[PDB]
Amino acid sequence: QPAHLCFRSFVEALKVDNDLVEINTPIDPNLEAAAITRRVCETNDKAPLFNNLIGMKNGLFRILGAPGSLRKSSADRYGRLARHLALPPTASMREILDKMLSASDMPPIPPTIVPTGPCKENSLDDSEFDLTELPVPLIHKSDGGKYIQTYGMHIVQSPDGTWTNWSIARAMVHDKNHLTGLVIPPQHIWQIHQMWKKEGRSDVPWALAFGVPPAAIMASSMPIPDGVTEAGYVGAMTGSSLELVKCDTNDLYVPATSEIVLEGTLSISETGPQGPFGEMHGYIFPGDTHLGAKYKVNRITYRNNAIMPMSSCGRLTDETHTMIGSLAAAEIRKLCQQNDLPITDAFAPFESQVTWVALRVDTEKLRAMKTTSEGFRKRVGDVVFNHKAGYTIHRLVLVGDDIDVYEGKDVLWAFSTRCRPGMDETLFEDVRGFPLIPYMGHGNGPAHRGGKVVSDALMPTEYTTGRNWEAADFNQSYPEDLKQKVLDNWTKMGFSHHHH
Amino acid sequence: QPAHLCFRSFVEALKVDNDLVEINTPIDPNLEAAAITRRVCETNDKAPLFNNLIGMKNGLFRILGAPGSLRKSSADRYGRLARHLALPPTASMREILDKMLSASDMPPIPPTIVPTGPCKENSLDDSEFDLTELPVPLIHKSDGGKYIQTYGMHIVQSPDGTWTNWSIARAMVHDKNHLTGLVIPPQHIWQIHQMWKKEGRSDVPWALAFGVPPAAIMASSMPIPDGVTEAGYVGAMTGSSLELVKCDTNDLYVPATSEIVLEGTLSISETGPQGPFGEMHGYIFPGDTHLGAKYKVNRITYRNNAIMPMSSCGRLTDETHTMIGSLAAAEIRKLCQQNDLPITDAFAPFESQVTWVALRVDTEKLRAMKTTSEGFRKRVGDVVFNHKAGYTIHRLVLVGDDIDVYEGKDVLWAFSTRCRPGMDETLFEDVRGFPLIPYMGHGNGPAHRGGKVVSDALMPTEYTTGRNWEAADFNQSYPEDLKQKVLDNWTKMGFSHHHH
Ligand SMILES: Cc1cc2c3c(c1C)C(C)(C)C[C@@H](O)N3c1c(nc(O)[nH]c1=O)N2C[C@H](O)[C@H](O)[C@H](O)COP(=O)(O)O
Ligand SMILES: Cc1cc2c3c(c1C)C(C)(C)C[C@@H](O)N3c1c(nc(O)[nH]c1=O)N2C[C@H](O)[C@H](O)[C@H](O)COP(=O)(O)O
Ligand SMILES: [K+]
Ligand SMILES: [K+]
Ligand SMILES: [K+]
Ligand SMILES: [K+]
Ligand SMILES: [Mn+2]
Ligand SMILES: [Mn+2]
């Protein structure tokens, strides 16, 4: 099966890329596996595959860390991510995000049901597993539980059957047959749960599939629109219908090649302790446990020699930056264009801990609007900060055409030099805030409201007659033929490879 | 003579360091020398010494570019700067700034007058030079003149004789015997000029010395206090009295080993066109000429085989970042401590284009103050933004003890995650602004007022009971003995030098 359609094949691809380290000696899931993965993420090293996990029994489980993290070279920086999508490993971020957006103007390709698959090779009923006896990792020393769920996909369906959502949300082991996790507004798992709670009749049928098709986990991490079934979006993206097998204990469908599947219910009544967890902004608040959603597990099915993917998330750079930030930015780009805003590109700079999105403006179009900074900031912020795609983002930075928003040095330069603090910004206090950011949930103000800003790094003539400066840089301050002369004589004169 | 006391010796030191490239074939001062230097600065390469400058006659002049720019390795990143000060080339930024601050609590060591020096080896009177016939560089393609003065020191004295100031301010050739340049408030060259204009009787006696003692050019770039003679501060810093020779045509004193000296007057009445110039924030606005101060040159004296230092300034990283930003930050650190604020460290992040200063707070001291963010922000901003040392800085970022302010990734992380936009900030509109920043002089508001902010990236418990989080990073999320195990087994398992 192709790498983008089968996780097992994706792991092969990483090896074949010289982007895997297989570790075949015993590794402890209590902190050691996650510490190694954390180091990998902080240094852009090869992904670790832990083939000999202390506590692995009857096939459950090996771990792959850092599945969506960065490579060290500039030339294939995003290669892991490209390998989720059948793109060349040298793909740019623009190309990856365009691929993720491509299905937005296509007919869905609904999934195909097949009678069996590798995820049915082994099973454990409700008398044969205990989630506390599996080698679930402790990912950070202060975590409030062992977070089994950092890179699987939750599957839930609206009561009427018309929408089946796939998404990533964290969850940890509560006891032998339950998890607790985040289920928070405005996320689709929360929106579907609320539909079942209003109906009031039963718990939510649920599945959690680990080691799903890579193209599916990327859509799971993206805020595609309300009511859109991720399976059909992924089908259209990839050009092929995804093969799914029915769960044994409910009527949900899971990818046929899933490594591990949990089947059960998400309660409409019960909660349990959840967190704290070392999180995407780089923090953990030891002891900050709160009540979360509660999941009951009735069945486990799994591939022979099952592999659990794991995100050891925190400070730069891991899946919570490369996928949450970039995929939100992608959706925000499209949302702005559909609202007739002249945005060409969007990216969440890593340097902002993916709390900012930089929006590149087509300033010829802006000039034809005959508008001002106050009016345009307000219009952009109203569109983005009132939408779910803007949930995680607290600062929007508007930049003109000369800025590559995929280069954080250039975004920082523009922000620092073109946006006058206060005057060139509009604060938004009456929008939904992202409580996970420390300055929100652990800060001085309301955890769930406000704290957002549009920072205009467009210069005044970009609204009127056009850019009126040149950069004081090698590229812009010197004629072409001089520049080329310098470059051609560089090593000759005495001064100091693209792939590397 | 030691490198820190004699520019010629400093050039030797750079060679001996393998930090120089001598270029002995002809190089054009029209753009080529500056383009090569710009490339060096953008890549942290070796400093260029142009020994064969097209237009060099009778010893005037060779050029050294990038005298205070960065080296490529992390281990001696600041080595050029260390070589200005007799510090080891591996000195940290903290050590460099401490050296620059050391004289603030010492008695001055006044300069020593000597009868002659190398700067008297050659002379040109007022019938024998023409500034338009010297190989003055055109530094950026759109500059409004040839900027002879990018790394020399202006020398002016108060009418009463009690204060002699040394400072860097840009100047360009106006005609055969005049320069024009910036002389703007609150700079000391401007403050002294205003004293002569109020007296109204003559033009200001003036000298401009190029290739001065390196320790002197660093104090020239630092906002030491009003009324303090830089020569005596440098004397105390270095532990030795600087040797100075009288000018021939006025009673000012110049460093004995200066490479090139201009003697003349700074007018109290006349102006002339000045600028535009590619500047420290990375911009030039083609055609934005304004009236500047006008200098008359009556005499040139110079060393045999004179060398002119040059800053090809603009986008990162050059002298305008390493010296202006860092030395302002140093003075701001001291200013805050003298106002009883619990600041331990300050640095202007390069990523902010040296428009921000991050202030590290001693949070045990802050807790004993029993204060709040609003009150503390206001107090810090009032101290800094009302003082000349804060002139160039538009954003102050307060951070706690866990942040290394000399590491821009950590400042960015703290700012992005700990400061709630709006709520955790105080805007300052009734302070002097720095018009050079594009969003000020070319922006939407008053060029000379406002646009400043204090951003509090202290978390709430840092004011009360103490830090209540741990970072989700390798360092803080894992015990010591696990961390060391990981490191010790790193290359063994399969994963990937300090000097490099
Ligand atoms: C890639 C990725 C995404 C997420 C998460 C993680 C990873 C690796 C964890 C490591 C597990 C950490 C956790 O904070 N986490 C997470 C989460 N969204 C939440 O509601 N809850 C979460 O606990 N998202 C983000 C969501 O996946 C996206 O916001 C997506 O858009 C949701 O799908 P939908 O609601 O739009 O269908
Ligand atoms: C290191 C350095 C410093 C400065 C400059 C440059 C360099 C390389 C130029 C390349 C020439 C560019 C120019 O923008 N420039 C410059 C300038 N200050 C100005 O009033 N005018 C200027 O044109 N400073 C900063 C000042 O040197 C400091 O603010 C210093 O504090 C002043 O001394 P004082 O007034 O405190 O005695
Ligand atoms: K999704
Ligand atoms: K602006
Ligand atoms: K000075
Ligand atoms: K704060
Ligand atoms: Mn969805
Ligand atoms: Mn001074």
Residue numbers in the entry:
A (entry chain A), B (entry chain A): 4 to 499, 502 to 505
Reported in the publication:
The UbiD superfamily is composed of a wide variety of (de)carboxylases acting on aromatic, hetero-aromatic, and unsaturated aliphatic acids. Prenylated FMN consists of an FMN molecule modified by the addition of a fourth non-aromatic ring joined via N5–C1′ and C6–C3′ linkages between the flavin and prenyl moieties. Following binding of prFMNreduced and formation of holo-UbiD, the cofactor undergoes oxidation to form the catalytically relevant oxidized prFMN species. In the UbiD enzyme family, Arg173, Glu277, and Glu282 (A. niger Fdc1 numbering) form a conserved ionic network.
Two crystal structures were obtained for E277Q, derived from two separate enzyme preparations. The second crystal structure of E277Q (1.03 Å) only reveals partial hydroxylation of the C1′. In the latter structure, the amide group of Gln277 occupies a similar position to the carboxyl of Glu277 in the wildtype protein. The presence of both of these adducts indicates that oxidative maturation of prFMN is able to take place for E277Q. In contrast, only very low levels of decarboxylase activity could be detected for the E277Q variant by analyzing for product formation using HPLC, suggesting an upper limit for kcatapp of 0.3 min−1. No significant exchange can be observed for E277Q, despite the detection of low levels of activity by HPLC. Surprisingly, activity for the E277Q variant was very low, although crystal structures reveal no significant structural perturbation in the active site. This suggests that Glu277 acts to tune the pKa of Arg173 and in turn Glu282.
